Write a protein that binds this ligand. Structure first.
Ligand SMILES: CNc1nc(Cl)nc2c1ncn2[C@@H]1CCCCO1
Length: 164
Protein backbone atom coordinates (compact mmCIF):
# COMPACT_ATOMS: atom_id res chain seq x y z
CA UNK A 1 0.00 0.00 0.00
CA UNK A 2 0.81 3.72 0.08
CA UNK A 3 -0.53 4.69 3.52
CA UNK A 4 2.72 4.31 5.47
CA UNK A 5 4.64 6.15 2.72
CA UNK A 6 2.18 9.06 2.92
CA UNK A 7 2.66 9.14 6.70
CA UNK A 8 6.44 9.37 6.28
CA UNK A 9 6.08 12.17 3.70
CA UNK A 10 3.80 14.13 6.04
CA UNK A 11 5.31 17.60 6.54
CA UNK A 12 8.63 16.46 5.07
CA UNK A 13 11.16 18.66 3.34
CA UNK A 14 12.52 17.45 0.00
CA UNK A 15 15.91 18.04 -1.64
CA UNK A 16 17.13 17.13 -5.13
CA UNK A 17 20.46 15.24 -4.99
CA UNK A 18 22.45 15.12 -8.24
CA UNK A 19 25.33 12.66 -8.51
CA UNK A 20 27.95 12.78 -11.26
CA UNK A 21 28.14 8.96 -11.44
CA UNK A 22 26.07 5.85 -10.78
CA UNK A 23 28.82 4.28 -8.66
CA UNK A 24 28.24 6.58 -5.70
CA UNK A 25 24.49 6.08 -5.79
CA UNK A 26 25.00 2.30 -5.76
CA UNK A 27 27.41 2.75 -2.84
CA UNK A 28 24.81 4.93 -1.11
CA UNK A 29 22.13 2.25 -1.60
CA UNK A 30 24.42 -0.48 -0.27
CA UNK A 31 25.73 1.35 2.80
CA UNK A 32 23.00 3.82 3.76
CA UNK A 33 25.25 6.90 3.55
CA UNK A 34 25.54 10.06 1.52
CA UNK A 35 28.04 12.92 1.26
CA UNK A 36 27.69 16.26 -0.51
CA UNK A 37 29.57 19.53 -1.03
CA UNK A 38 29.97 21.88 1.96
CA UNK A 39 27.25 24.36 0.89
CA UNK A 40 24.60 21.62 0.63
CA UNK A 41 25.91 19.89 3.77
CA UNK A 42 25.14 22.99 5.82
CA UNK A 43 21.67 23.23 4.25
CA UNK A 44 20.91 19.59 5.02
CA UNK A 45 22.17 19.85 8.61
CA UNK A 46 19.86 22.85 9.22
CA UNK A 47 16.92 21.02 7.62
CA UNK A 48 17.45 17.81 9.63
CA UNK A 49 16.75 19.66 12.88
CA UNK A 50 13.73 21.57 11.56
CA UNK A 51 11.57 18.86 10.01
CA UNK A 52 10.04 15.52 10.93
CA UNK A 53 11.53 14.00 7.75
CA UNK A 54 14.15 15.25 5.29
CA UNK A 55 13.82 13.39 1.96
CA UNK A 56 16.65 13.18 -0.59
CA UNK A 57 15.56 12.46 -4.17
CA UNK A 58 18.47 11.12 -6.23
CA UNK A 59 19.23 11.72 -9.90
CA UNK A 60 22.43 10.71 -11.71
CA UNK A 61 23.48 13.39 -14.19
CA UNK A 62 22.69 12.46 -17.83
CA UNK A 63 20.62 9.40 -16.86
CA UNK A 64 17.24 10.96 -17.64
CA UNK A 65 15.82 9.36 -14.48
CA UNK A 66 15.59 9.51 -10.72
CA UNK A 67 17.21 6.53 -8.98
CA UNK A 68 15.18 6.53 -5.76
CA UNK A 69 14.72 8.46 -2.55
CA UNK A 70 15.76 8.22 1.08
CA UNK A 71 15.20 9.82 4.47
CA UNK A 72 18.00 11.52 6.43
CA UNK A 73 18.54 9.68 9.71
CA UNK A 74 21.42 11.81 11.03
CA UNK A 75 23.30 15.06 10.65
CA UNK A 76 26.65 14.83 8.87
CA UNK A 77 29.52 13.37 10.88
CA UNK A 78 33.27 13.35 10.30
CA UNK A 79 35.67 10.52 10.84
CA UNK A 80 34.10 7.08 10.88
CA UNK A 81 34.37 4.46 8.17
CA UNK A 82 35.93 6.07 5.05
CA UNK A 83 33.51 5.83 2.14
CA UNK A 84 35.26 4.99 -1.13
CA UNK A 85 33.42 7.48 -3.30
CA UNK A 86 34.40 7.74 -6.95
CA UNK A 87 35.45 11.34 -7.11
CA UNK A 88 34.58 13.67 -10.01
CA UNK A 89 37.15 15.75 -11.89
CA UNK A 90 38.56 17.76 -8.99
CA UNK A 91 36.49 16.63 -5.99
CA UNK A 92 38.85 15.54 -3.21
CA UNK A 93 37.61 13.33 -0.40
CA UNK A 94 38.02 16.43 1.78
CA UNK A 95 35.15 18.16 -0.04
CA UNK A 96 32.97 15.09 0.74
CA UNK A 97 34.14 14.47 4.30
CA UNK A 98 30.79 14.79 6.07
CA UNK A 99 28.76 11.57 6.00
CA UNK A 100 24.99 11.51 6.49
CA UNK A 101 23.24 8.28 7.40
CA UNK A 102 20.12 7.63 5.30
CA UNK A 103 17.28 5.10 5.24
CA UNK A 104 16.11 4.23 1.75
CA UNK A 105 12.40 4.53 1.11
CA UNK A 106 12.49 3.52 -2.56
CA UNK A 107 15.41 2.12 -4.57
CA UNK A 108 13.41 1.95 -7.83
CA UNK A 109 13.95 4.26 -10.82
CA UNK A 110 11.53 6.89 -12.16
CA UNK A 111 12.11 8.29 -15.68
CA UNK A 112 11.88 12.06 -16.14
CA UNK A 113 9.11 11.60 -18.72
CA UNK A 114 6.75 10.45 -15.94
CA UNK A 115 7.26 13.66 -13.88
CA UNK A 116 6.82 16.22 -16.68
CA UNK A 117 3.54 17.38 -15.09
CA UNK A 118 5.25 18.44 -11.81
CA UNK A 119 6.82 21.87 -11.40
CA UNK A 120 8.81 23.22 -8.48
CA UNK A 121 7.75 26.64 -7.08
CA UNK A 122 11.19 27.04 -5.51
CA UNK A 123 12.86 26.75 -8.94
CA UNK A 124 10.72 29.20 -10.93
CA UNK A 125 8.09 26.49 -11.60
CA UNK A 126 10.49 24.67 -13.88
CA UNK A 127 9.90 20.91 -14.20
CA UNK A 128 11.05 19.17 -11.04
CA UNK A 129 13.73 17.21 -12.94
CA UNK A 130 15.50 20.56 -13.49
CA UNK A 131 17.66 21.85 -10.68
CA UNK A 132 21.13 21.96 -9.19
CA UNK A 133 22.39 19.55 -6.57
CA UNK A 134 20.77 20.51 -3.27
CA UNK A 135 17.74 22.32 -4.77
CA UNK A 136 14.84 22.29 -2.33
CA UNK A 137 11.53 20.96 -3.67
CA UNK A 138 8.29 22.44 -2.34
CA UNK A 139 6.11 20.20 -0.14
CA UNK A 140 3.27 19.54 -2.59
CA UNK A 141 5.50 18.91 -5.65
CA UNK A 142 7.84 16.70 -3.64
CA UNK A 143 5.05 14.58 -2.15
CA UNK A 144 3.54 13.94 -5.59
CA UNK A 145 6.95 13.13 -7.09
CA UNK A 146 7.61 10.52 -4.39
CA UNK A 147 4.17 8.99 -4.97
CA UNK A 148 5.04 8.60 -8.69
CA UNK A 149 7.77 6.03 -8.01
CA UNK A 150 6.98 2.33 -8.35
CA UNK A 151 6.41 0.65 -4.98
CA UNK A 152 9.59 -0.88 -3.52
CA UNK A 153 8.16 -3.99 -1.90
CA UNK A 154 11.55 -4.93 -0.39
CA UNK A 155 11.40 -2.01 2.09
CA UNK A 156 9.38 -2.08 5.33
CA UNK A 157 8.58 1.49 6.42
CA UNK A 158 7.80 0.38 9.99
CA UNK A 159 11.37 0.98 11.18
CA UNK A 160 11.52 4.34 9.39
CA UNK A 161 8.33 5.52 11.10
CA UNK A 162 9.77 4.79 14.56
CA UNK A 163 12.68 7.19 13.95
CA UNK A 164 10.36 10.17 13.41
C1 LIG B 1 29.07 11.04 -2.83
N1 LIG B 1 28.49 12.29 -3.38
C2 LIG B 1 28.66 12.86 -4.63
N2 LIG B 1 29.16 12.08 -5.68
C3 LIG B 1 29.32 12.71 -6.89
CL1 LIG B 1 30.00 11.65 -8.23
N3 LIG B 1 29.05 13.98 -7.28
C4 LIG B 1 28.54 14.77 -6.23
C5 LIG B 1 28.34 14.22 -4.91
N4 LIG B 1 27.82 15.23 -4.08
C6 LIG B 1 27.70 16.34 -4.83
N5 LIG B 1 28.11 16.14 -6.17
C7 LIG B 1 28.08 17.32 -7.17
C8 LIG B 1 26.91 17.32 -8.17
C9 LIG B 1 26.93 18.65 -8.92
C10 LIG B 1 28.28 18.92 -9.57
C11 LIG B 1 29.42 18.72 -8.57
O1 LIG B 1 29.30 17.47 -7.89
Amino acid sequence: GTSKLKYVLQDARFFLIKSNNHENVSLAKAKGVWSTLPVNEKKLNLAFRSARSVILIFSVRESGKFQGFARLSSESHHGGSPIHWVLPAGMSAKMLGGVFKIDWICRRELPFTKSAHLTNPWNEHKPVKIGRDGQEIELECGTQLCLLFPPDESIDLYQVIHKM
